[PDB]
Design a protein around this ligand. Structure first.
Ligand SMILES: Oc1cccc(Br)c1
Ligand SMILES: Oc1cccc(Br)c1
Ligand SMILES: [Ca+2]
Ligand SMILES: [Ca+2]
Ligand SMILES: [Ca+2]
Ligand SMILES: [Ca+2]
Ligand SMILES: [Zn+2]
Length: 316
Protein backbone atom coordinates (compact mmCIF):
# COMPACT_ATOMS: atom_id res chain seq x y z
CA UNK A 1 0.00 0.00 0.00
CA UNK A 2 0.76 3.70 -0.12
CA UNK A 3 1.99 5.34 3.11
CA UNK A 4 5.03 6.41 5.09
CA UNK A 5 7.95 4.14 6.03
CA UNK A 6 8.28 3.54 9.78
CA UNK A 7 10.07 1.21 12.16
CA UNK A 8 8.14 -1.10 14.44
CA UNK A 9 9.41 -3.39 17.18
CA UNK A 10 8.42 -6.92 18.16
CA UNK A 11 9.48 -10.40 19.23
CA UNK A 12 10.08 -13.39 16.99
CA UNK A 13 9.26 -17.07 17.37
CA UNK A 14 12.22 -17.74 19.68
CA UNK A 15 11.44 -14.73 21.90
CA UNK A 16 14.07 -12.36 20.53
CA UNK A 17 13.34 -8.64 20.15
CA UNK A 18 13.93 -7.04 16.81
CA UNK A 19 13.05 -3.95 14.84
CA UNK A 20 11.07 -4.36 11.60
CA UNK A 21 10.41 -2.04 8.70
CA UNK A 22 6.73 -1.19 8.39
CA UNK A 23 4.49 1.25 6.52
CA UNK A 24 1.93 3.57 8.11
CA UNK A 25 -1.45 4.39 6.62
CA UNK A 26 -4.08 4.32 9.38
CA UNK A 27 -2.68 0.98 10.48
CA UNK A 28 0.93 -0.12 10.52
CA UNK A 29 1.54 -2.76 7.87
CA UNK A 30 4.31 -5.32 7.45
CA UNK A 31 5.56 -3.59 4.33
CA UNK A 32 9.30 -2.86 4.15
CA UNK A 33 10.05 -0.14 1.58
CA UNK A 34 13.74 -0.06 2.25
CA UNK A 35 14.49 -3.13 0.13
CA UNK A 36 13.84 -3.33 -3.60
CA UNK A 37 10.19 -3.03 -4.59
CA UNK A 38 9.17 -4.07 -1.12
CA UNK A 39 8.97 -6.91 1.36
CA UNK A 40 5.35 -7.72 2.25
CA UNK A 41 4.04 -10.09 4.92
CA UNK A 42 0.52 -11.47 5.00
CA UNK A 43 -1.79 -13.27 7.46
CA UNK A 44 -3.24 -16.49 6.02
CA UNK A 45 -5.37 -16.82 9.21
CA UNK A 46 -5.02 -20.58 9.54
CA UNK A 47 -6.43 -21.14 6.01
CA UNK A 48 -4.89 -21.99 2.65
CA UNK A 49 -6.27 -19.18 0.52
CA UNK A 50 -3.19 -17.11 -0.54
CA UNK A 51 -1.85 -14.67 0.08
CA UNK A 52 -4.37 -13.70 2.77
CA UNK A 53 -4.35 -10.09 3.99
CA UNK A 54 -1.46 -7.67 4.25
CA UNK A 55 -0.45 -7.77 7.90
CA UNK A 56 -1.99 -4.81 9.75
CA UNK A 57 -1.31 -3.73 13.31
CA UNK A 58 -2.78 -0.79 15.27
CA UNK A 59 0.30 0.41 17.09
CA UNK A 60 3.51 -0.82 15.41
CA UNK A 61 4.34 -3.16 18.33
CA UNK A 62 4.39 -6.84 17.50
CA UNK A 63 4.75 -8.70 20.78
CA UNK A 64 1.71 -10.96 20.73
CA UNK A 65 2.22 -14.70 20.24
CA UNK A 66 0.18 -14.47 17.03
CA UNK A 67 2.60 -11.81 15.75
CA UNK A 68 5.83 -13.77 16.21
CA UNK A 69 5.82 -15.80 12.96
CA UNK A 70 5.08 -12.65 10.98
CA UNK A 71 7.91 -10.74 12.65
CA UNK A 72 10.40 -13.45 11.70
CA UNK A 73 9.12 -14.04 8.16
CA UNK A 74 9.40 -10.31 7.51
CA UNK A 75 12.78 -9.82 9.21
CA UNK A 76 14.50 -12.88 7.78
CA UNK A 77 13.26 -12.00 4.29
CA UNK A 78 15.15 -8.76 4.79
CA UNK A 79 18.27 -10.56 5.94
CA UNK A 80 18.12 -12.86 2.91
CA UNK A 81 17.60 -9.85 0.64
CA UNK A 82 20.65 -8.21 2.18
CA UNK A 83 22.77 -11.33 1.74
CA UNK A 84 22.11 -11.57 -1.98
CA UNK A 85 22.52 -7.85 -2.55
CA UNK A 86 25.63 -7.23 -0.43
CA UNK A 87 27.41 -10.52 -1.17
CA UNK A 88 26.43 -11.36 -4.77
CA UNK A 89 25.22 -8.00 -6.12
CA UNK A 90 21.81 -9.56 -6.79
CA UNK A 91 18.71 -7.39 -6.37
CA UNK A 92 15.98 -9.78 -5.26
CA UNK A 93 15.23 -13.09 -6.88
CA UNK A 94 14.71 -11.92 -10.46
CA UNK A 95 17.69 -9.56 -10.27
CA UNK A 96 15.38 -6.55 -10.75
CA UNK A 97 14.04 -6.02 -7.23
CA UNK A 98 10.90 -8.12 -7.47
CA UNK A 99 8.65 -7.72 -4.46
CA UNK A 100 9.13 -10.39 -1.81
CA UNK A 101 5.80 -11.63 -0.38
CA UNK A 102 5.28 -14.08 2.52
CA UNK A 103 2.22 -15.55 4.21
CA UNK A 104 2.24 -16.88 7.76
CA UNK A 105 -0.31 -18.86 9.79
CA UNK A 106 -0.85 -21.09 6.77
CA UNK A 107 -3.39 -23.84 7.53
CA UNK A 108 -3.49 -25.64 10.87
CA UNK A 109 -0.57 -27.55 12.39
CA UNK A 110 1.24 -27.40 9.06
CA UNK A 111 4.81 -28.74 9.45
CA UNK A 112 6.35 -27.13 6.39
CA UNK A 113 7.29 -23.93 4.56
CA UNK A 114 7.50 -23.52 0.77
CA UNK A 115 7.87 -21.22 -2.18
CA UNK A 116 4.73 -21.54 -4.29
CA UNK A 117 6.10 -20.01 -7.51
CA UNK A 118 5.18 -16.49 -6.45
CA UNK A 119 5.55 -16.14 -2.70
CA UNK A 120 6.67 -17.70 0.61
CA UNK A 121 4.29 -19.73 2.71
CA UNK A 122 4.89 -20.75 6.34
CA UNK A 123 3.05 -23.19 8.55
CA UNK A 124 2.94 -22.82 12.31
CA UNK A 125 3.99 -26.45 12.89
CA UNK A 126 2.10 -28.76 15.23
CA UNK A 127 4.18 -27.78 18.23
CA UNK A 128 5.86 -31.17 18.43
CA UNK A 129 7.67 -31.79 15.18
CA UNK A 130 7.95 -28.10 14.36
CA UNK A 131 7.23 -24.66 15.85
CA UNK A 132 6.40 -21.81 13.37
CA UNK A 133 8.80 -22.34 10.53
CA UNK A 134 9.74 -18.71 9.91
CA UNK A 135 11.67 -18.89 13.19
CA UNK A 136 14.43 -20.66 11.27
CA UNK A 137 16.64 -18.30 9.29
CA UNK A 138 18.04 -21.27 7.36
CA UNK A 139 14.46 -22.35 6.50
CA UNK A 140 13.51 -18.88 5.31
CA UNK A 141 16.59 -18.47 3.15
CA UNK A 142 16.44 -22.06 1.90
CA UNK A 143 12.97 -21.52 0.59
CA UNK A 144 13.60 -17.99 -0.74
CA UNK A 145 16.64 -19.41 -2.58
CA UNK A 146 14.25 -21.57 -4.67
CA UNK A 147 12.90 -18.34 -6.15
CA UNK A 148 16.29 -17.40 -7.53
CA UNK A 149 17.11 -20.95 -8.60
CA UNK A 150 13.83 -21.08 -10.52
CA UNK A 151 14.65 -17.74 -12.15
CA UNK A 152 18.24 -18.66 -13.12
CA UNK A 153 19.32 -22.39 -13.70
CA UNK A 154 15.69 -23.48 -13.50
CA UNK A 155 16.62 -26.89 -12.16
CA UNK A 156 13.66 -29.20 -12.58
CA UNK A 157 12.33 -30.61 -9.31
CA UNK A 158 12.96 -34.30 -9.86
CA UNK A 159 15.84 -36.80 -9.79
CA UNK A 160 19.40 -35.38 -9.85
CA UNK A 161 18.50 -31.88 -11.05
CA UNK A 162 15.97 -31.73 -8.21
CA UNK A 163 18.49 -32.87 -5.65
CA UNK A 164 20.85 -30.11 -6.85
CA UNK A 165 18.02 -27.59 -6.55
CA UNK A 166 17.48 -28.70 -2.93
CA UNK A 167 21.19 -28.69 -2.09
CA UNK A 168 21.52 -25.19 -3.51
CA UNK A 169 18.81 -24.05 -1.15
CA UNK A 170 20.49 -25.77 1.84
CA UNK A 171 23.82 -24.25 0.85
CA UNK A 172 22.59 -20.65 0.63
CA UNK A 173 20.21 -21.14 3.56
CA UNK A 174 23.28 -22.01 5.60
CA UNK A 175 25.40 -19.16 4.23
CA UNK A 176 22.64 -16.71 5.09
CA UNK A 177 22.56 -18.18 8.62
CA UNK A 178 26.30 -17.58 8.89
CA UNK A 179 25.82 -14.08 7.40
CA UNK A 180 23.39 -13.19 10.18
CA UNK A 181 25.85 -14.84 12.59
CA UNK A 182 23.43 -16.04 15.28
CA UNK A 183 24.35 -19.58 16.33
CA UNK A 184 25.37 -20.57 12.79
CA UNK A 185 25.98 -24.20 11.80
CA UNK A 186 25.84 -26.64 8.88
CA UNK A 187 22.59 -28.20 10.06
CA UNK A 188 19.12 -27.42 8.68
CA UNK A 189 16.14 -26.30 10.72
CA UNK A 190 17.55 -26.78 14.23
CA UNK A 191 15.88 -23.60 15.58
CA UNK A 192 12.35 -24.73 14.78
CA UNK A 193 12.53 -28.56 14.81
CA UNK A 194 11.33 -30.75 17.68
CA UNK A 195 11.07 -28.23 20.53
CA UNK A 196 11.38 -31.05 23.07
CA UNK A 197 14.59 -32.49 21.66
CA UNK A 198 17.80 -30.52 21.76
CA UNK A 199 20.68 -30.74 19.32
CA UNK A 200 18.76 -32.22 16.39
CA UNK A 201 17.76 -30.92 12.95
CA UNK A 202 15.91 -32.20 9.89
CA UNK A 203 19.02 -32.53 7.75
CA UNK A 204 22.76 -32.22 8.25
CA UNK A 205 25.20 -30.89 5.60
CA UNK A 206 28.24 -31.85 7.62
CA UNK A 207 27.03 -35.42 8.10
CA UNK A 208 23.98 -36.15 5.95
CA UNK A 209 23.98 -39.74 7.17
CA UNK A 210 23.10 -38.58 10.70
CA UNK A 211 19.53 -38.46 9.51
CA UNK A 212 19.69 -41.24 6.86
CA UNK A 213 20.59 -39.24 3.77
CA UNK A 214 23.36 -40.40 1.44
CA UNK A 215 26.85 -38.88 1.63
CA UNK A 216 28.21 -40.72 -1.42
CA UNK A 217 26.83 -41.26 -4.95
CA UNK A 218 26.97 -45.01 -4.50
CA UNK A 219 24.45 -44.59 -1.67
CA UNK A 220 21.96 -42.62 -3.76
CA UNK A 221 18.27 -43.36 -3.70
CA UNK A 222 17.07 -44.65 -7.09
CA UNK A 223 13.30 -44.91 -6.42
CA UNK A 224 10.30 -42.78 -7.32
CA UNK A 225 9.22 -41.36 -3.96
CA UNK A 226 10.12 -37.76 -3.06
CA UNK A 227 10.22 -36.97 -6.80
CA UNK A 228 13.15 -39.37 -7.15
CA UNK A 229 14.72 -38.42 -3.82
CA UNK A 230 15.21 -34.68 -4.16
CA UNK A 231 15.35 -34.19 -0.40
CA UNK A 232 17.40 -37.34 0.10
CA UNK A 233 20.08 -37.26 -2.58
CA UNK A 234 20.65 -33.58 -1.82
CA UNK A 235 22.91 -34.96 0.94
CA UNK A 236 25.51 -35.95 -1.65
CA UNK A 237 25.82 -32.39 -2.88
CA UNK A 238 25.47 -30.88 0.62
CA UNK A 239 28.44 -32.99 1.74
CA UNK A 240 30.47 -31.90 -1.27
CA UNK A 241 29.69 -28.25 -0.48
CA UNK A 242 30.56 -28.73 3.19
CA UNK A 243 33.92 -30.30 2.26
CA UNK A 244 34.75 -27.52 -0.20
CA UNK A 245 34.27 -24.99 2.63
CA UNK A 246 35.44 -26.87 5.67
CA UNK A 247 37.72 -29.58 4.30
CA UNK A 248 38.04 -33.11 5.56
CA UNK A 249 38.74 -36.71 4.57
CA UNK A 250 35.68 -38.63 3.43
CA UNK A 251 35.79 -42.26 2.40
CA UNK A 252 39.56 -41.84 2.29
CA UNK A 253 39.55 -38.79 0.00
CA UNK A 254 41.11 -35.62 1.42
CA UNK A 255 39.78 -32.15 0.67
CA UNK A 256 41.49 -28.88 1.49
CA UNK A 257 38.90 -26.40 2.68
CA UNK A 258 38.70 -22.95 1.12
CA UNK A 259 36.04 -21.42 3.40
CA UNK A 260 32.41 -20.30 3.22
CA UNK A 261 32.78 -17.12 1.20
CA UNK A 262 34.57 -18.88 -1.69
CA UNK A 263 32.05 -21.73 -1.53
CA UNK A 264 29.32 -19.09 -1.91
CA UNK A 265 31.01 -17.30 -4.79
CA UNK A 266 31.61 -20.58 -6.64
CA UNK A 267 28.10 -21.95 -6.24
CA UNK A 268 26.46 -18.58 -6.94
CA UNK A 269 28.37 -18.36 -10.24
CA UNK A 270 27.58 -21.96 -11.09
CA UNK A 271 23.91 -21.40 -10.39
CA UNK A 272 23.60 -18.24 -12.48
CA UNK A 273 25.96 -18.93 -15.41
CA UNK A 274 26.43 -22.66 -15.99
CA UNK A 275 23.57 -24.79 -14.63
CA UNK A 276 20.51 -25.58 -16.74
CA UNK A 277 17.10 -27.14 -16.03
CA UNK A 278 18.26 -30.74 -16.50
CA UNK A 279 21.75 -30.59 -15.05
CA UNK A 280 22.88 -33.73 -13.30
CA UNK A 281 25.49 -34.23 -10.63
CA UNK A 282 28.37 -34.69 -13.08
CA UNK A 283 27.32 -31.50 -14.80
CA UNK A 284 27.19 -29.70 -11.46
CA UNK A 285 30.78 -30.75 -10.86
CA UNK A 286 31.81 -29.34 -14.24
CA UNK A 287 29.98 -26.09 -13.56
CA UNK A 288 31.60 -25.70 -10.14
CA UNK A 289 35.00 -26.40 -11.61
CA UNK A 290 34.48 -23.86 -14.36
CA UNK A 291 33.18 -21.32 -11.90
CA UNK A 292 36.18 -21.73 -9.62
CA UNK A 293 38.43 -21.53 -12.72
CA UNK A 294 36.79 -18.24 -13.78
CA UNK A 295 37.14 -16.77 -10.26
CA UNK A 296 40.55 -18.01 -9.05
CA UNK A 297 42.32 -19.59 -12.04
CA UNK A 298 42.72 -23.00 -13.62
CA UNK A 299 45.72 -23.63 -11.36
CA UNK A 300 44.21 -22.50 -8.06
CA UNK A 301 43.80 -24.45 -4.91
CA UNK A 302 40.10 -23.54 -5.19
CA UNK A 303 39.75 -25.60 -8.34
CA UNK A 304 41.67 -28.52 -6.84
CA UNK A 305 39.45 -28.43 -3.77
CA UNK A 306 36.28 -28.47 -5.78
CA UNK A 307 37.59 -31.52 -7.67
CA UNK A 308 38.59 -33.25 -4.44
CA UNK A 309 35.18 -32.66 -2.88
CA UNK A 310 33.28 -34.14 -5.79
CA UNK A 311 35.75 -37.04 -5.89
CA UNK A 312 35.08 -37.60 -2.18
CA UNK A 313 31.33 -38.05 -2.71
CA UNK A 314 31.71 -40.17 -5.84
CA UNK A 315 30.70 -37.67 -8.49
CA UNK A 316 32.78 -37.83 -11.68
O1 LIG B 1 16.17 -15.97 -4.06
C1 LIG B 1 16.32 -14.69 -3.54
C2 LIG B 1 17.31 -13.88 -4.11
C3 LIG B 1 17.49 -12.56 -3.67
C4 LIG B 1 16.69 -12.09 -2.65
C5 LIG B 1 15.77 -12.92 -2.04
BR1 LIG B 1 14.83 -12.23 -0.60
C6 LIG B 1 15.55 -14.22 -2.48
O1 LIG C 1 13.01 -25.95 3.51
C1 LIG C 1 12.45 -26.36 4.72
C2 LIG C 1 11.08 -26.30 4.92
C3 LIG C 1 10.54 -26.75 6.13
C4 LIG C 1 11.38 -27.23 7.13
C5 LIG C 1 12.74 -27.27 6.91
BR1 LIG C 1 13.89 -27.89 8.25
C6 LIG C 1 13.30 -26.84 5.72
CA1 LIG D 1 0.39 -4.40 18.01
CA1 LIG E 1 21.89 -22.40 13.94
CA1 LIG F 1 21.17 -24.22 10.59
CA1 LIG G 1 14.89 -29.98 18.40
ZN1 LIG H 1 13.73 -26.88 -0.78
Amino acid sequence: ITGTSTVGVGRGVLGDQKNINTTYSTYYYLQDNTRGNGIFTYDAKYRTTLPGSLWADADNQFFASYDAPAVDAHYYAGVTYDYYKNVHNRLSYDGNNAAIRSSVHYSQGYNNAFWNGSQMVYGDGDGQTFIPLSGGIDVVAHELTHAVTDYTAGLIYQNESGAINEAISDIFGTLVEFYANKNPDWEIGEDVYTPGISGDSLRSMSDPAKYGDPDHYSKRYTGTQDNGGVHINSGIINKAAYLISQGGTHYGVSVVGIGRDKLGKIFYRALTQYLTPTSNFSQLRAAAVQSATDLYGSTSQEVASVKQAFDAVGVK
